[PDB]
Design a protein around this ligand. Structure first.
Ligand code: HEM
Ligand SMILES: CCOC(=O)CCCCCCn1ccnc1
Ligand SMILES: [Cl-]
Ligand SMILES: [Mg+2]
Ligand SMILES: [Mg+2]
Length: 430
């Protein structure tokens, strides 16, 4: 007989640690592990932090991908932070997922995220101004207009007061914003959404499991990027695609592959993780109603810490991979030049060596040095200011229009080692 709406999901006792998981039951290199309940996953990373803070795992092989060599998993905050801040040792080349890069993949996935400096920073500087706090602040009106309309439409479209948060708010809000920043016409936003979803959801049968489909999607978005870039070359617009085609690095314009890769990076990065932060945030407010109440009764005062706690809690990017350029030793584990190293942000963000009470979802948490946007340094998330603003506005519009919005079913969770995703989240309101 809990308070609230009759079909709301069960609440949880805030602060309860999950049971730790016997190490023999942990297989980071099997998709089956990524299908387990998030409580079991959290307890497994707790076991690793305790018993095997640096451990070795085989690489998963999604259909058509090349697994290649295995990887050393860094599950402690300090090691993820150290690796992030030493890119001369922990290189982002040749890939930031664990699979091997191939020439075929590099045509579409060869952006600055898989490069070291100086070339990485010369590419990043083409677009960095558009993502700075003061420039992102100027698009508050666009974020608010879109979020307000989406929440209003949830109400207008659903006489029964039941909706899917993902398709009706969390997905379409960041999609609109990044597509408008890129200069993509509204008629194509839903094609961009589907392409994003396949690129980042590959291996989940609800998204795609045929490598031919992954490659067709990659080629189609790459061709879309090229064609839009060609238009902007001839007639400039005040959009990021125009910035990309007009730029020079080391005195040369970007090639077609560089344009395609940069466009794909920005549009794919620019929507799915923010979508998932919003959905995980609504799930957390549903499980921890006292946190909802405290945010709703001081929205602007708590918003800066609340948004960061949602990102720490959700850790929308589970890991990033690096490749060693020289031998090292961490925690008595020798690792060799050329070895793959995986940085588990999801685990760093529960590390009791860094966080007081890591199992408490605390929207006032301060300080909150989470690694949800990475450990800092050269590749720190370009979109962090944009994501923070989108998350804040989405929750402010829910608070104002449907303050008792609550999840009514447990999420359908994306099957992924890389992205902590929710495919559907049914919600209701009064
Ligand atoms: C809550 C949402 C988001 C999370 C949790 C997130 C997380 C991350 C993480 C962990 C990295 C890697 C950092 C590193 O290697 O040190 C990253 C990089 C990146 N993110 Fe995000 N991101 C989010 C939203 C966005 C948005 C909205 C964009 C907009 C386009 C974006 C664009 C990028 C780009 C371009 C990079 C590569 C930066 C570089 O290589 O210099 N992200 N993000
Ligand atoms: C993996 C296949 O897609 C790519 O290579 C391009 C997008 C990479 C996104 C990396 C994850 N992310 C999302 C938001 N900030 C970071
Ligand atoms: Cl939760
Ligand atoms: Mg419906
Ligand atoms: Mg436009």
């Amino acid at each position: 007989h809990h308070m609230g709406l009759n079909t709301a999901i069960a609440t949880r006792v805030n602060g309860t640690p999950p049971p730790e998981v016997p190490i023999a039951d942990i297989e980071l290199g099997s998709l089956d592990f990524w299908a387990l309940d998030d409580d079991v996953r959290d307890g497994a990373f707790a076991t690793l932090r305790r018993e095997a803070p640096i451990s070795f795992w085989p690489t998963i092989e999604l259909p058509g991908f090349v697994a290649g060599n295995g990887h050393w998993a860094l599950t402690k905050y300090d090691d993820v932070f150290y690796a992030s801040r030493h890119p001369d040792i922990f290189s982002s080349y040749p890939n930031i997922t664990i699979n091997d890069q191939t020439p075929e993949l590099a045509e579409y996935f060869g952006s600055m995220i898989v490069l070291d400096d100086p070339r990485h920073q010369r590419l990043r500087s083409i677009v960095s101004r558009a993502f700075t706090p003061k420039v992102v602040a100027r698009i508050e009106a666009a974020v608010r207009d879109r979020a307000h309309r989406l929440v209003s439409s949830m109400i207008a479209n659903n006489p029964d007061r039941q909706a899917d948060l993902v398709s009706e708010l969390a997905g379409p809000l960041p999609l609109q914003i990044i597509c408008d920043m890129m200069g993509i016409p509204k008629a194509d936003h839903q094609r961009i959404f589907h392409w994003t979803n396949v690129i980042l959801g590959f291996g989940d049968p609800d998204l795609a499991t045929d490598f031919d489909e992954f490659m067709q999607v990659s080629a189609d978005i790459g061709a879309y990027a090229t064609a839009l870039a060609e238009d902007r070359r001839v007639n400039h617009h005040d959009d990021l695609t125009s910035s990309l085609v007009e730029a020079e690095v080391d005195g040369e314009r970007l090639s077609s592959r560089e344009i395609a890769s940069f466009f794909i990076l920005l549009v794919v990065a620019g929507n799915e993780t923010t979508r998932n932060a919003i959905t995980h945030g609504v799930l957390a407010l549903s499980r921890y109603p006292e946190q909802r109440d405290r945010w709703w009764s001081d929205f602007d005062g708590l918003a800066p810490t609340a948004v960061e706690e949602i990102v720490r809690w959700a850790s929308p990017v589970v890991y990033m991979r690096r490749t060693l350029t020289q031998d090292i030793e961490l925690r008595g584990t020798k690792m060799a030049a050329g070895d793959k190293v995986s940085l588990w942000y999801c685990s760093a963000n529960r590390d009791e060596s860094k966080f007081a009470d890591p199992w408490t979802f605390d929207l006032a948490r301060n300080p909150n040095p989470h690694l949800g946007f990475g450990g800092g340094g050269a590749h720190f998330c370009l979109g962090a200011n944009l994501a923070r603003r989108e998350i804040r506005v989405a929750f402010d519009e829910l608070r104002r229009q449907m303050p008792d919005v609550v999840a009514t079913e447990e999420p359908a969770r994306l099957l992924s080692q890389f992205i902590h995703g929710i495919k559907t989240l049914p919600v209701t309101w009064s």
